[PDB]
Design a binder for these strands. Sequence first.
RNA 1: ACCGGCGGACGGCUCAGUAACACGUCGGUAACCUACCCUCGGGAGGGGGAUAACCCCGGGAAACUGGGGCUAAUCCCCCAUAGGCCUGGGGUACUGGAAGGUCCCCAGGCCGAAAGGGAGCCGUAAGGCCCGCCCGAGGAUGCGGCGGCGGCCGAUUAGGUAGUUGGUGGGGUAACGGCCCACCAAGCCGAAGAUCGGUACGGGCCGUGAGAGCGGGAGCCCGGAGAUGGACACUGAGACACGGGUCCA
Lengths: 241, 113, 99, 125
Amino acid sequence: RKGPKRHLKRLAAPTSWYIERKAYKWAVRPRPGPHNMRTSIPLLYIVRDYLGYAKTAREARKILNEGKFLVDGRVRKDYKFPVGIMDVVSIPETGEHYRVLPNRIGKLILHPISEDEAFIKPLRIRNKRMIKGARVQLNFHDGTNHIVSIAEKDNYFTSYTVLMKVPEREILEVLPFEKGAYVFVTQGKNVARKGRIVEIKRFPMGWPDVVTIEDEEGELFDTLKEYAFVVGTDKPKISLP
Amino acid sequence: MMRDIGLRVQPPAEKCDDPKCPWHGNLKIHGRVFEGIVVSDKPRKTVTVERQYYFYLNKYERYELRRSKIHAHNPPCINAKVGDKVLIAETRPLSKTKHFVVVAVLERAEERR
Amino acid sequence: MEIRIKEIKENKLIGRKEIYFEIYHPGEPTPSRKDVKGKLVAMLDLNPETTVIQYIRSYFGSYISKGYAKAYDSKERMLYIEPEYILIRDGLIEKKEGE
Amino acid sequence: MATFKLVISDPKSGIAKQVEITGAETEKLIGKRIGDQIPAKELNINLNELFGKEFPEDVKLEIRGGTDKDGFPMRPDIHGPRRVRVLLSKGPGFRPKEKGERRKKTVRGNTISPEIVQVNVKLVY
RNA sequence: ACCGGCGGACGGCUCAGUAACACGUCGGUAACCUACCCUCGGGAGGGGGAUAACCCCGGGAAACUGGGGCUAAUCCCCCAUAGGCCUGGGGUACUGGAAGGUCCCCAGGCCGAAAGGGAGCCGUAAGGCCCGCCCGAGGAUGCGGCGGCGGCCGAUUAGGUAGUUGGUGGGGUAACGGCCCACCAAGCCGAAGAUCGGUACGGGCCGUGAGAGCGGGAGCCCGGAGAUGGACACUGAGACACGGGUCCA
């Protein structure tokens, strides 16, 4: 290969989209964008398969273009687009709102939450670094970015909760993670769980960094700091298998 | 030169380095670390570390011995003793067989028990 | 022969009801699309030229047919949107567009 | 090899039309380089040179271009009369239009000899 | 029909060679780039200019080729607004496991940003929905690079090596590097099987067997390799290019 694959195959389409893998031979490959191709949920799958509102890709493309979905506050029109994890997907035309969440199974599920929560998108930022004018800027794994501060120490190192107002692309209500805060686990093999952090202590040097948590049941889990994602003091609800 | 390397360890007390070391330039220390006994220390600013490991035979429930050689660069400040382990870090390529510098030197000795 | 409605979807954006049919034939041949035209307009409860017939397959010997139909408000919308097999089976248009 | 046909081009109306030259009246034209002045005063088989310029009368021409038997053009400063192979690109001759923007075609040189079938010329008198 | 932009490097096919850092898994490039695309921030001011089409016309059985007057665009350029990059000196603030990358000031040097849109809708034109361009940062995606371990047979192949092992300076690359180069040294490698000959895409798996084990690499998916044999550059984030060019057989 000497070039981006423009075609994805059906036998190369995973079980995590919960798709029939012998259906044709070609699967919908999003164009590069926020998220990974196999860790995304296609716009084709959401209109066509999920809801029955299309019975051909022409139906679903025409339907998206006229409008039946806005993702993050802004317009889309083709079915090629990698929808991220911890995103906000909207049906304005039905008034449904979903979160893109893992199961224990590790398949992407759209989990319904109320119209209220569509406004919110929790960010836990990917890195934090200086840009010119001596201002630091916020980053994400869906590329969702904001600029402008005064530099300095600021709210956290990188483990944040932000409340994000999605039509405005604004940040509001900043909040640290603590040793009494909430995390939902959204990578690793311990996914779908939502609990209270016991302590954020870790193995102090080298590449491994552990963070540990307990829950409502109170099971003890260990996951990377990168695979800890701070919901807040809870903003979205749990994902169910 | 004499600066922290991470990992809850420091180089020896007297450490001064040359440009092809992790404390100079954009060669930098990262990631992994290795231990091995010194075979040869005749080539300049170079020592060879050898690691004995065992490999398993599933057919016969038993082991065999294998000895991979790694070429390591030694700062000219410190020197290493034969038949005892030296501790290496993983930095970007120096030359052809070198990718590795010696961070810290340990020296041990014996007779009979 | 008897047509019954199993399942009803309401698609608002395009203004149609998307509908599932189970059609019977007991001791009788495989349902005849020409009577099913006459029968349809009442079941769906929309005008006769905007009540659309699609999909039927017929079980081997077990006398039940599974199927799908459309009831549309908008005559404008329906030719354009829909995938070609429907438009011919109902009788509206053919096969859209060649090489 | 071949005889001289001359295409006389008028910048005044954008009309080119052609007169026939014996091709042994062109041995006062031999050895010139492009841009040189050709005298015509025996050469002119018409009373307006078809279109001109007018009587004619007894005009000069300047050398626009030439063309060969395959239709190959003069390119300014190719040395000598023989067919020479060069990487062309844009401009006079075999011109690329697809991926990688060279082409070696062989093209006719820029010294006037009888191997030129047709000399393009511009009415500059 | 001509410039723009984007695909044509993909998709599809085959597996000859290659026993190796090919491939698998874990690591890891803080040495390196990444356009179309996606995000957030900001920018598109002014001046300059063309060639087909059209008009006219020559040749070749052809392939194919033309010379010129006029002329449009998101046409092609410059300047400024800056930004980028290098280099010397001071110092802080973000990120890190550390090394230390990112901040800012200053001096001197270079390069020296950008472009717009028809019938509609939104704004006053720009702009935007839509399509695309520029700069800063990020993301995704692709390419290259390093390490651990695993990585066939014949000893009627036992000693092998001269950029060859290392040091120092340097060139060149997107970039680490004996990659290439100058100098300086004589090292490096080997019986836990080097080197040489020979054979073979590797893996998930598959076939068989109660198992242990044996046997296998085929449809299919994953990664690499090839496109009459060999050599060679250009355009592009991406080709030394599977239905492109140059050239040799």
